Design a protein around this ligand. Sequence first.
Ligand SMILES: *[B@@]1([O])O[C][C]([C][O])O1
Ligand code: NA
Length: 263
Amino acid sequence: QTSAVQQKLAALEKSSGGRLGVALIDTADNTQVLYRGDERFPMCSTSKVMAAAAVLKQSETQKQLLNQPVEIKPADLVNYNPIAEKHVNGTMTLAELSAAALQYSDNTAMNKLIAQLGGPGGVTAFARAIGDETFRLDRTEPTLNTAIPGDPRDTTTPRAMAQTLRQLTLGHALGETQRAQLVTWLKGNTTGAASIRAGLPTSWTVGDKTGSGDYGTTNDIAVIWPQGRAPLVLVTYFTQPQQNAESRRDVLASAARIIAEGL
Ligand SMILES: *[B@@]1([O])O[C][C]([C][O])O1
Ligand code: NA
């Protein structure tokens, strides 16, 4: 059966032309609101949270790891390198790579995080270790954003990603300093103003990571702190039938506006 929330999300989806996936977790009582919550969607850059978190986890036993410089060579640059392009024939530390990947969605930075973990399978292995049985990372940047209909590579479900984001930021999948660092990075994101944040009250604190890819894939995952209330986790994934479709961040803002009612 459906609630009024799910009915509103279905109407938004119908108007949008695409396929919408939503998962809300209310940490006051662990209740969940799901819309296509167990369908797979292409993660695109939302996968960068798992990669950064995996490096944070490594740093719990190698305590200087975030300070380690990593060389950036011309050959490393991919399709979207806003921060890494300033360091060609130079370096960025693992902390700097994590900040660039998360806060600017730099794709070269993500490739360095993936390499630090031994490849896409190392990111997936971290996911499994923290209890995410759904996430899979198969490719590096930029091919992980192809977002082809029916392709299971580089996908997860809204339910699984919301549970993981909760465990990484509000729970204890990471150590105490690492969890705080991830929260700081997500709160300082620069790419999210038109997505979930645009549908929520401006007084609420939000940490988020966006994603964009082919098939007009438009995603955002967020941890949300209303002022006088237990925090929430919200995943909004959206993908479209046409390879060339334009981005639809407004759909994510609209989904967030629906979900926020009564919270
Ligand atoms: B993620 O999705 O955020 C931006 C970049 C563009 O390739 O990837
Ligand atoms: Na940066």
